[PDB]
Amino acid sequence: QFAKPEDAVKYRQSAVTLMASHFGRMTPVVKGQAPYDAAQIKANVEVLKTLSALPWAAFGPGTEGGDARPEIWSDAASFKQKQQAFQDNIVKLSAAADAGDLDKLRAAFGDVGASCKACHDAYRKK
Amino acid sequence: QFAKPEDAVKYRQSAVTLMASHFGRMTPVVKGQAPYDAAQIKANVEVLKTLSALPWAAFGPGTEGGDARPEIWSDAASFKQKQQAFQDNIVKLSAAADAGDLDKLRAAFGDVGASCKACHDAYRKK
Ligand code: HEC
Ligand code: HEC
């Protein structure tokens, strides 16, 4: 869907920006600093689920640029693995949110955050 | 969810960037320059539906900046009207996509694009 590779860069940066906001805005809730409203979180995690699927299609072939390391393309199977692990952890977070269980939500949230960091440590230019 | 108003600006710009891509990527399909796959479009319009709800909450009070005109806040009822008309037209586009009907899709797509433009003409700094 991108006329030029820069367009893919701008898309994926916007997608991870929105993902980061929908993930990170729950930090005060997981920590107990903000109240836990099960329906609020269920709805937010549904948004995060949609968003978390979107960046990966904007790392198509020839879309090198931004802060993506070139390893994303030369090691396509390792990157796909990191994306799928991340989205599988999103599935666990959805299940926690849908169950309305703050303890499960906390655990799942920390697993998702670790899978964000693991991808960045390997595939994001510092 | 925004620590500073700039964060709201960066969110809403990313949200409308993603919305614009999910809308505009269908242009070749509506024009017949690319094939029409009903399931492909249904799924894309589901993504667009989610995204089209997201910018508006990032124009909260005190979040003046970017290319938003100040009129968004002083005329809150007129802006809300423009957002709701836009999202109602998104509902019509979802119904067309869910029906698998290219003629209805075409019509609905042009209504959505007109409601993008109408908001920009009043509320987006040139
Ligand atoms: C790989 C499988 C990733 C996962 C999982 C997550 N992110 Fe990431 N992110 C990744 C890359 C390769 C990049 C660089 C993109 C580019 O072309 O520049 C990023 C970038 C970010 C950013 C910065 C965006 C900006 O516009 O500056 C943020 C804020 C970010 N990523 C956040 C983030 C979060 C919170 C994640 C899990 C919920 C997450 N990312 C996962 C690769 C990958
Ligand atoms: C008001 C009810 C709007 C509707 C409907 C749409 N958009 Fe818009 N858009 C609006 C504003 C106020 C702004 C400025 C935001 C800011 O703070 O800077 C925008 C901006 C855009 C942009 C530019 C984003 C950038 O990062 O440069 C694009 C590409 C854009 N909008 C696209 C777009 C499309 C395609 C729409 C319908 C599908 C649409 N917008 C509707 C306000 C409103």
State the CATH number of the domain containing residue B82: 1.20.120.10
- Which resolution, in Å, applies to this structure? 1.3
Nearest alpha carbon to residue A67 among A118, A16, A4, A23: A16
* B91 contacts: CB under 8 Å, gap ≥ 6: B49
Could you give the count of Cα atoms lying within 13 Å of B58 in the half-sphere of its Cβ? 27
Cβ contacts of B54 on chain A, cutoff 8 Å: 18, 47
Q: Which of A7, A15, A21 sits opposite B1 (nearest CB)?
A: A21
Query: Using an 8 Å Cβ cutoff, are B8 and B61 in contact?
Result: no
Nearest alpha carbon to residue A81 among A56, A45, A51, A54: A56
Ligand 1 contact, A20 CB (< 6 A): yes
Work out how many domains chain B is built from and give that number. 1
Q: How far is CA B112 from CA A104, B19, B87, B116, in A?
A: 40, 12, 8, 6
Q: Which of A2, A10, A18 sits opposite B15 (nearest CB)?
A: A18
Output phi, psi for B25, to 5 deg.
-65, -15
Say if the Cβ atoms of A18 and B11 lie within 8 Å. Answer: yes
- How far does the CA of residue A11 sit from the closest CA of chain B (Å)? 6
Query: Using an 8 Å Cβ cutoff, are A97 and A56 in contact?
Result: no
Say if the Cβ atoms of B15 and A15 lie within 8 Å. Answer: no
**Residue A99 CA from chain centroid, whole number:** 21
Distance B31 CA to ligand 2 centre (A): 23
With H, G, I as helix, E, B as strand and everything else as coil, classify residue B64: coil
Q: How far is CA A113 from CA A26, A63, A117, in A?
A: 11, 26, 6
Distance CA B97, CA B115 (A): 18
DSSP of A59-86: S-TT---TTB-THHHHTHHHHHHHHHHH
Q: Residue A67 is encoded by which pair of tokens? A: 């802060």
- Ligand 1 pocket: which of A109, A120, A121 to mutate (most atoms within 8 A of CB): A120
The single-letter code of the amino acid at A32 is G
Q: Which of A18, A21, A24 sits opposite B18 (nearest CB)?
A: A18
Q: What range does the domain containing A71 cover?
A: 2-126
* A41 contacts: CB under 8 Å, gap ≥ 6: A26, A29, A97, A105
